[PDB]
Enzyme design. Structure first.
Site, PDB file in Angstrom:
ATOM      1  N   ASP A   1       9.462  78.632  44.107  1.00  0.00           N
ATOM      2  CA  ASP A   1      10.308  79.521  44.915  1.00  0.00           C
ATOM      3  C   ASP A   1      11.269  80.285  44.036  1.00  0.00           C
ATOM      4  O   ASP A   1      12.452  79.962  43.928  1.00  0.00           O
ATOM      5  CB  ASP A   1      11.021  78.700  45.981  1.00  0.00           C
ATOM      6  CG  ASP A   1      11.474  79.513  47.169  1.00  0.00           C
ATOM      7  OD1 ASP A   1      12.213  78.950  48.022  1.00  0.00           O
ATOM      8  OD2 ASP A   1      11.089  80.707  47.260  1.00  0.00           O
TER       9      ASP A   1
ATOM     10  N   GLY B   1      20.301  81.755  55.054  1.00  0.00           N
ATOM     11  CA  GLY B   1      20.989  82.970  54.618  1.00  0.00           C
ATOM     12  C   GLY B   1      21.553  82.826  53.212  1.00  0.00           C
ATOM     13  O   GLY B   1      21.872  83.838  52.576  1.00  0.00           O
TER      14      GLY B   1
ATOM     15  N   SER C   1      19.704  81.347  50.871  1.00  0.00           N
ATOM     16  CA  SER C   1      18.516  81.293  50.034  1.00  0.00           C
ATOM     17  C   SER C   1      18.538  82.363  48.971  1.00  0.00           C
ATOM     18  O   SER C   1      19.020  83.483  49.198  1.00  0.00           O
ATOM     19  CB  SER C   1      17.257  81.437  50.874  1.00  0.00           C
ATOM     20  OG  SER C   1      17.062  80.298  51.709  1.00  0.00           O
TER      21      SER C   1
END
Ligand SMILES: N=C(N)c1ccc2cc(NC(=O)Nc3ccccc3)ccc2c1
Length: 246
Positions: free
Chosen positions: A97, A196, A198
């Site tokens: 990620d 939010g 992230s």
């Protein structure tokens, strides 16, 4: 950010505020990011994977509020959006990620460092902080899990790193959390990152140097007992970052 404190961009000058323009002209906040060099912002692939069109994004540096054009801020478009090729998402866990955004002003320039716009150092390989170390997180994410609006003012908090052996306990995340991920939480479970936040930074002071140790990635709920925040362990990805920024 659940709990913590309100802050301003001069305290978090590497923080990038990333928005998306929708057909019709509306602009909405997407995720945080971190400036690692003048032309490059690092964030999380999960922020972009469903809308992977670089022309859709607006990146601000030097911005302290969701809806104010902060004095000294600079606005950019994305010249190149680089997503990690082996990104995937399980029920909870997100893998690889990590994403890179090459930024450019309308005149074709990268960021100009200032008092409110600065880079954050990358970690060195095999040298992350010990478990129990306190690190900071920053973002425009939710203040409570039940909220649907994001705070107008930027927030920060401080959490402690949790070992892989503890994070893999059955009441924590078991085998869902891997060695490429780092856990961090409040021992009393009152403050955490949330939806939010992230893509934003987990910054640890290590050996006297402020370092981008993690990138906000995932978690079960926000500030839940035995459910730490999970971050991409940036040190594992140094080869990938280096190769994609050359
Ligand atoms: N506990 C945390 N530190 C944490 C970190 C990042 C998180 C990210 C979240 N993002 C999240 O659930 N995004 C989403 C948006 C639309 C549909 C389905 C899912 C939610 C909770 C989170 C919680």
């Amino acid at each position: 950010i659940i709990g913590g404190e309100f802050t301003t961009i001069e305290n978090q000058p590497w923080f990038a505020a990333i928005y998306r323009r929708h057909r019709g002209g509306s602009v909405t906040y997407v995720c945080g990011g971190s400036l690692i060099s003048p032309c490059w912002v690092i964030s999380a692939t999960h922020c972009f994977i469903d809308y992977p069109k670089k022309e859709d994004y607006i990146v601000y540096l030097g911005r302290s509020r969701l809806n104010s054009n902060t004095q000294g801020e600079m606005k950019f478009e994305v010249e190149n959006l680089i997503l990690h090729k082996d990104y995937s998402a399980d029920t909870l866990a997100h893998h690889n990620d990590i994403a890179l955004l090459k930024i450019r002003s309308k005149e074709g320039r990268c960021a100009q460092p200032s008092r409110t716009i600065q880079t954050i150092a990358l970690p060195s390989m095999y040298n992350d902080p010990q478990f129990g170390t306190s690190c900071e997180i920053t973002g425009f994410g939710k203040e409570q899990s039940t909220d649907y609006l994001y705070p107008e003012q930027l927030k920060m908090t401080v959490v402690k790193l949790i070992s892989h052996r503890e994070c893999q306990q059955p009441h924590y995340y078991g085998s869902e959390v891997t060695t490429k991920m780092l856990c961090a939480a409040d021992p009393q479970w009152k403050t955490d990152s949330c939806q939010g936040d992230s893509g934003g930074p987990l910054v640890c002071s290590l050996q006297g140097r402020m370092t981008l140790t993690g990138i906000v990635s995932w978690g079960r709920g926000c500030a839940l007992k035995d459910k730490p925040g999970v971050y991409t362990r940036v040190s594992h990805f140094l080869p990938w970052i280096r190769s994609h920024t050359k």
